[PDB]
Amino acid sequence: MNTVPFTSAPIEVTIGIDQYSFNVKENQPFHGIKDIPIGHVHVIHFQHADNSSMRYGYWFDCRMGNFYIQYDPKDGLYKMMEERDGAKFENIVHNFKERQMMVSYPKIDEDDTWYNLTEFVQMDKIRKIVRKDENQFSYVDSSMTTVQENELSDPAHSLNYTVINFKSREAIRPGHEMEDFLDKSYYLNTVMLQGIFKNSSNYFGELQFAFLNAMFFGNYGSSLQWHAMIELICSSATVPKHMLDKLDEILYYQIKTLPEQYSDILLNERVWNICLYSSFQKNSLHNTEKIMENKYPELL
Amino acid sequence: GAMNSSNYAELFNNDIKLFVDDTNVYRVTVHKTFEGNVATKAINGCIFTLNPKTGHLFLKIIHTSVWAGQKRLSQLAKWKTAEEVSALVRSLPKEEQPKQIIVTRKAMLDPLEVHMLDFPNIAIRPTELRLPFSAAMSIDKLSDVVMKATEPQMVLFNIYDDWLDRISSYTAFSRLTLLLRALKTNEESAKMILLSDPTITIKSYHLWPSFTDEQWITIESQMRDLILTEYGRKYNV
Numbered sequence: 305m306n307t308v309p310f311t312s313a314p315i316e317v318t319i320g321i322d323q324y325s326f327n328v329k330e331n332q333p334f335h336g337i338k339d340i341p342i343g344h345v346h347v348i349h350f351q352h353a354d355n356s357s358m359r360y361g362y363w364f365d366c367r368m369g370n371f372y373i374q375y376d377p378k379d380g381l382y383k384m385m386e387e388r389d390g391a392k393f394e395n396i397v398h399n400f401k402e403r404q405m406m407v408s409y410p411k412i413d414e415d416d417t418w419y420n421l422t423e424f425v426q427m428d429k430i431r432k433i434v435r436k437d438e439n440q441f442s443y444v445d446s447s448m449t450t451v452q453e454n455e456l457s458d459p460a461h462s463l464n465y466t467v468i469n470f471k472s473r474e475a476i477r478p479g480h481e482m483e484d485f486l487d488k489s490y491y492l493n494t495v496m497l498q499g500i501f502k503n504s505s506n507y508f509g510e511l512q513f514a515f516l517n518a519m520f521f522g523n524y525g526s527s528l529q530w531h532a533m534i535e536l537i538c539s540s541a542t543v544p545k546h547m548l549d550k551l552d553e554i555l556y557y558q559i560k561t562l563p564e565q566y567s568d569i570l571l572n573e574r575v576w577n578i579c580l581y582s583s584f585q586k587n588s589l590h591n592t593e594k595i596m597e598n599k600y601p602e603l604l
Numbered sequence: 605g606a607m608n609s610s611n612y613a614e615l616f617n618n619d620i621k622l623f624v625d626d627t628n629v630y631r632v633t634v635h636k637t638f639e640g641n642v643a644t645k646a647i648n649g650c651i652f653t654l655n656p657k658t659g660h661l662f663l664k665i666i667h668t669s670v671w672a673g674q675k676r677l678s679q680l681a682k683w684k685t686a687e688e689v690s691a692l693v694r695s696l697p698k699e700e701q702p703k704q705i706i707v708t709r710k711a712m713l714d715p716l717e718v719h720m721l722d723f724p725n726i727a728i729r730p731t732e733l734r735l736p737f738s739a740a741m742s743i744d745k746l747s748d749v750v751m752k753a754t755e756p757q758m759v760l761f762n763i764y765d766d767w768l769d770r771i772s773s774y775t776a777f778s779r780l781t782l783l784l785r786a787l788k789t790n791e792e793s794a795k796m797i798l799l800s801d802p803t804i805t806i807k808s809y810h811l812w813p814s815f816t817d818e819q820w821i822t823i824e825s826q827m828r829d830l831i832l833t834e835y836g837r838k839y840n841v
């Protein structure tokens with residue numbers, strides 16, 4: 305189990321760690337988060353009490369280094385930093401654990417939620433979508449735009465998701481215009497899976513990461529990306545059976561975890577109704593359709 | 605975006621544009637089978653592609669063989685239309701290609717957009733005008749060439765005949781749409797109006813009769829009466 309210590313908490317802030325969150329009061333004696341499960345990526349995220357504008361946060365994997373949070377009063381935010389001195393970090397953390405100034409990552413032992421949300425997500429791929437190569441962790445916030453959004457404006461601060469566009473030359477073979485537009489199996493299986501992503505695990509990793517950025521930060525272009533990657537599978541007549549089975553599990557846990565009160569903005573009525581009721585795969589997503597219908601029947 | 609009454613003069617400016625109407629591409633008769641079931645038999649169709657400024661009509665005849673062995677023909681019909689319009693544009697010299705294509709039904713937008721991805725600089729637009737181009741098959745010479753075709757074929761017409769020698773393209777389009785609206789609302793009466801007087805003939809190289817200016821005014825008035833009428837007979841007013 306690993307630890308993300310904090311220098312202090314000078315401003316009142318709601319702190320998220322994966323799907324958990326807690327409130328820290330201004331100058332409260334808070335020095336970090338302990339017992340973080342190894343083996344998974346994680347996200348530590350923030351919403352200031354004085355400005356709910358700009359949720360922001362850091363994707364990290366504790367196997368890749370010793371990270372800590374230090375508030376910056378010039379830039380006005382909690383920054384994730386890396387400690388190179390391993391012995392100073394051990395000495396610094398032990399002191400905080402002895403004085404019991406840390407919150408424990410509160411995982412229930414039955415609970416596979418976080419694994420199920422991040423199964424295919426890898427830090428190395430995160431770092432290719434979020435380009436800032438001098439750091440081992442990745443900063444995301446509510447306002448960052450995607451490469452595709454900038455095409456429709458600071459390129460350094462962008463989310464470089466894989467561009468999916470159903471009315472594009474990449475998606476449509478000359479002379480198969482109708483075939484490829486109404487059955488996107490070519491675009492999914494040949495262009496995206498074999499050509500760009502290489503395998504379905506990398507495809508599902510980006511899909512899961514886009515969902516989590518949409519949910520934790522309200523990042524609008526992430527939500528677009530998540531719905532596009534769902535729709536590309538559902539709009540293909542020919543999808544390997546194992547991918548469909550896994551997609552159903554993936555979406556099921558995403559719908560299960562979504563805050564009930566955010567469904568209106570994070571779920572696209574058109575995509576979901578199309579996917580569950582009109583698409584080639586309308587009959588292939590049993591778990592997802594069942595939870596969608598029992599939890600958000602208004603949307604449908 | 606969409607085309608409506610507020611930007612009506614855009615049609616007659618000097619940017620090349622084409623209207624595309626697909627309402628006569630897939631045409632059927634419905635009939636009973638020996639077993640008392642119902643079946644369709646297709647008949648020949650046409651794409652109506654019109655330059656509203658010049659009158660040039662690119663009439664692509666759709667022979668029934670194109671449907672043989674195909675499923676979901678009303679959906680295929682929209683994509684066949686888009687394929688044929690795209691082939692037409694590509695056949696035209698660059699300086700003759702349209703800058704906009706306006707479709708008369710919104711269901712043609714995605715089929716045409718996909719077929720024209722190679723032409724990112726051609727705008728594909730809908731319209732809010734209820735244009736009567738479906739009545740094109742009530743023009744005898746157009747219906748005649750469609751029904752006689754034994755193979756796919758493209759036939760070029762000027763739907764304004766020689767009118768542009770005497771009137772603007774705005775007035776010529778207004779005349780065309782009035783004529784076609786009448787033919788759509790009551791074909792027999794419209795056709796009677798156009799041909800009652802045997803001394804006004806249709807030249808071999810024209811579609812409509814050779815009316816003088818004064819005679820077009822009488823004709824146009826008669827077509828309005830018919831349209832207001834039928835609108836009464838319809839709504840009892």
Ligand SMILES: CCCNC(=O)c1csc(Br)c1
Nearest residue numbers: 309310311372373387393396
């Ligand atoms: C200039 C940064 C000084 N603070 C540290 O090096 C440090 C390492 S773990 C924690 Br908590 C703080």
